Write a protein that binds this ligand. Structure first.
Ligand SMILES: Cc1cc2c3c(c1C)C(C)(C)C[C@@H](O)N3c1c(nc(O)[nH]c1=O)N2C[C@H](O)[C@H](O)[C@H](O)COP(=O)(O)O
Ligand SMILES: Cc1cc2c3c(c1C)C(C)(C)C[C@@H](O)N3c1c(nc(O)[nH]c1=O)N2C[C@H](O)[C@H](O)[C@H](O)COP(=O)(O)O
Ligand SMILES: O=C(O)c1cc2ccccc2s1
Ligand SMILES: O=C(O)c1cc2ccccc2s1
Ligand SMILES: [K+]
Ligand SMILES: [K+]
Ligand SMILES: [K+]
Ligand SMILES: [K+]
Ligand SMILES: [Mn+2]
Ligand SMILES: [Mn+2]
Lengths: 500, 500
């Protein structure tokens, strides 16, 4: 049970890393837990483990906040993510996204069924649990319900049994034995729900597993292709078949060390009030009156001393940014490569509220295409904005070889100086839009359509003969021998650790 | 001779502030001085004073780099600018821009003529100086000449004597007694040059004063209106009439404590090779072959132990950003107010390479206008992009009351989440463009025209009934009593100085 394969092991890894704060005094799930977690995410502090949660009863539950948020140091900024994947805590974004993409051209390693696991240590039936009596957090003061589900994985399977999807989608407590949640196109939970609704025979067999293997929650957050079972993708990525146990009340399979498992159904007919919720872009519209999907809970199984992970999402920086934004970027990089586009790297700048993706271009391959900005912009746009991987992304910024797209400042520099507004852009109004972005859902135009752009920050010679500028910076506007002299004499002259 | 009125006094103030490094060992004006200064600006280190400059002869000259660049601490980030203006070193951007705008509705305090000053301590005639024999810096390795002029003020007067303009415009050594420089529309040095050329009688009487009163170099960098004599604007802003001495060889007047004064003429007929230069947006195009204005130097007068100030401009953060960007923003704020637009604040985000201005909107006044995004966008655009104050700015971002426009992260948040690409924007293709921006001068379209946009990051209800969201952040999504409890218990629980 290594950290990347066992949530309990992961929590011990964060403690050992000095990247955990154990709070053992009573904390209120009504806003206090989430407020502390929000402050953590805004300051890149240590992850909070709430061992003493007002209203925890019969082992349900402790909370771990900020499971995938950032560390303060530059040197191990992404160490929490690295700990999800068995990577060194010093891993770069590139290394993390490469790991997440590694299984894309490997044969799946399907999961291994085991008779039991720690998730079966405790159970509560139909008659023994009430979801309104559990210490479910109120995460933001105007939230329209207590969001039990911010970092567990929904498990649904196609009617024909050939595709089992694992994904994060939010869900809140509706009553003693129901949740309501987001189930929206083009998301795979929605695609599978549609399959069941067209068969029209029954409600969707469903499970929701919290505190799953960290590598599985990463894949849960990533738009891997339609029809690809996350379990086998994680198996290939890690090199280890995941151990799953059967649900007690249906024939779905859950990670054996899951902290907490809900078993039940996702309705093909019923809805209920859902949200509003304080969301990845940084907003809540109090009183929004949306309907969402309705889940019925038949059973709860859980580990002794069960830990619920929780994302207190909103303004920078949390799991919606570090995981949902970055993993969409990774999938867009691959999608571009598979469509023969000379894209080396992609990242969703945090500064853009992960609504942009910067696409680094191999300009030597670009030159060999003998194309133009308008033609290339359109082709990139068509590929990414007509695919599910481009769903959440409203601006693509194309940048040449000199720009590190993992560095927001360099993306903003290139964008601001190399893309002429209007002329160097193409607008896409007949593509699916992401309604959660306030200028979509709460804006001047159609909530679900358009509002997308490809901004070309490639300079004209980058299409023809090659970069025709040097940066007016220390790196490029001074010869190596001089730069090294300045650096060697810096403190001697009177000017002012990598880890620290 | 207070710091804001005397450059020599200002240099002592920086020393006293522990905001100066005196380098007393030999430094090469060929790139070394500028490389050290560039590294300073990229790191917000102390200002370098080069007391020992290879090729300094007969008192010409020492160099002070980064005179208006940033300090490392948040608490006195803008202290170098504050020192230009007699403000406390802790002054905010708002306070600095308010000071710079204060003289806009005050009667000018015209300058006082004095018989002599420290700038007359030494003189070199026609026969005694050679500009190629002075320690003029090579500021970037691909610069097309040694840029003597990066932080002195050009002094030119209208033919009718009614308007004396002070301004920064770059200039490089052309030969023993000529400079070439940028003189471009709509800049006042260009407007006055045009007046002389249409009279057609003589070349423009000219002076270039280096190490002028800090408050005068600030006004030199700011687009105060057409026909307004900077000297009297600085007089009103400071409450003190500036003391000026007459040039020896013409009837122009220079600050009495100027470190170094060039006297001569700006040609109405001749040009010469100018640039390329490592520029405010962060770029140099080596080999650009531009012609520029040609200045003839007839005389040099200077202080004993004369100090030349130098801007090693380029990538963030230097005087082109802190002064030229911010002071244009200030003038745009005022221009908007004078056109009855409900704008409270303006700032040019550094992240935008000071190509954007964020305009904070008083949304209560906006609501009372009973307008729409398209109408308001157009009116704001028309005002700012058809005036000289909007010259350098290619994107206006309109933001409501909740956004601090002095905080780049909050501007980028609002822009990224509240402005729908295309639909919430208006493009302006028939306005003057700033060719120095690489996507203009070196881009796909006309160098001098268009490429401007007003991006509306006001939300729809901000025009009608009022903000209809709360931020999903620590400040807004938790009640005051809880936020204060979290902050009071922060270190007790195990989480981690304003000055530091
Ligand atoms: C990391 C993470 C991702 C998501 C979410 C959150 C986190 C932390 C919440 C805090 C719970 C906020 C919730 O709004 N949320 C969420 C969501 N996708 C939705 O359809 N609906 C959601 O409510 N994603 C994103 C999806 O996880 C990815 O888009 C993924 O690609 C889906 O899997 P699939 O459909 O590709 O299989
Ligand atoms: C602060 C500062 C401003 C400027 C410049 C620099 C600095 C440091 C250089 C480093 C020397 C780079 C030089 O490119 N440069 C510069 C320039 N304006 C130009 O027309 N030409 C220039 O070459 N401005 C801006 C002008 O100073 C302002 O636009 C001002 O408003 C002009 O005065 P006016 O015409 O309004 O009287
Ligand atoms: O509540 C939220 O923050 C989110 C909802 C969704 C829907 C789809 C993709 C990402 C997200 S993030
Ligand atoms: O050389 C440069 O960086 C600059 C040239 C100009 C011209 C006008 C306004 C600002 C600048 S800044
Ligand atoms: K997934
Ligand atoms: K471009
Ligand atoms: K000026
Ligand atoms: K808008
Ligand atoms: Mn999937
Ligand atoms: Mn002027």
């Amino acid at each position: 049970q290594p950290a990347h394969l066992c949530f309990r092991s992961f929590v011990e890894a964060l403690k050992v890393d000095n990247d955990l704060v154990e709070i053992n005094t009573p904390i209120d799930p009504n806003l206090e837990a989430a407020a502390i977690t929000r402050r953590v995410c805004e300051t890149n502090d240590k992850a909070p483990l709430f061992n003493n949660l007002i209203g925890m009863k019969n082992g349900l539950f402790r909370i771990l906040g900020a499971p995938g948020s950032l560390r303060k140091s530059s040197a191990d900024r992404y160490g929490r993510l690295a700990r999800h994947l068995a990577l060194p805590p010093t891993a770069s974004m590139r290394e993390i996204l490469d790991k997440m993409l590694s299984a894309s051209d490997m044969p799946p390693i399907p999961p291994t069924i085991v008779p039991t696991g720690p998730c079966k240590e405790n159970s509560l039936d139909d008659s023994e649990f009430d979801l309104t009596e559990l210490p479910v957090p109120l995460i933001h003061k105007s939230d329209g319900g207590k969001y039990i589900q911010t970092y567990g994985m929904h498990i649904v399977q196609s009617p024909d049994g050939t595709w089992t999807n694992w994904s994060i989608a939010r869900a809140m407590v509706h009553d003693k034995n129901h949740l309501t949640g987001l189930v929206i196109p083009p998301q795979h939970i929605w695609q599978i729900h549609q399959m069941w609704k067209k068969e029209g025979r029954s409600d969707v067999p469903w499970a929701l597993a919290f505190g799953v293997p960290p590598a599985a929650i990463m894949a849960s957050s990533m738009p891997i292709p339609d029809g690809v079972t996350e379990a086998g993708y994680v198996g290939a990525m890690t090199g280890s078949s995941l151990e799953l146990v059967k649900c007690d009340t249906n024939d779905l399979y859950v990670p054996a060390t899951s902290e907490i498992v809900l078993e039940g159904t996702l309705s093909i007919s019923e809805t209920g009030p859902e949200g509003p919720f304080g969301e990845m872009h940084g907003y809540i519209f109090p009183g929004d009156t949306h309907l969402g999907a309705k889940y019925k809970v038949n059973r709860i199984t859980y580990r002794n001393n069960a830990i619920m992970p929780m994302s207190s999402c909103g303004r920078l920086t949390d799991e919606t940014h570090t995981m949902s934004g970055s993993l969409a970027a990774a999938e867009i990089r691959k999608l571009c490569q598979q469509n023969d586009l000379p894209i080396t790297d992609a990242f969703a700048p945090f500064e853009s509220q992960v609504t942009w993706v910067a696409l680094r271009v191999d300009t030597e391959k670009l030159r060999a295409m003998k194309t133009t900005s308008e033609g290339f912009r359109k082709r990139v746009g068509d590929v990414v904005f007509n695919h599910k991987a481009g769903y959440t992304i409203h601006r693509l910024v194309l940048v040449g070889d000199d720009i590190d797209v993992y560095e927001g400042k360099d993306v903003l520099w290139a964008f601001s100086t190399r893309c002429r507004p209007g002329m160097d852009e193409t607008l896409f109004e007949d593509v699916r839009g992401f309604p959660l972005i306030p200028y979509m859902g709460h804006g001047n135009g159609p909530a679900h359509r358009g509002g997308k752009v490809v901004s070309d920050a490639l300079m004209p010679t980058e299409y023809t003969t090659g970069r025709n500028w040097e940066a007016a910076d220390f790196n490029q506007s001074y010869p190596e021998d001089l730069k090294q002299k300045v650096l060697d004499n810096w403190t001697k002259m009177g000017f002012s650790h990598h880890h620290h």
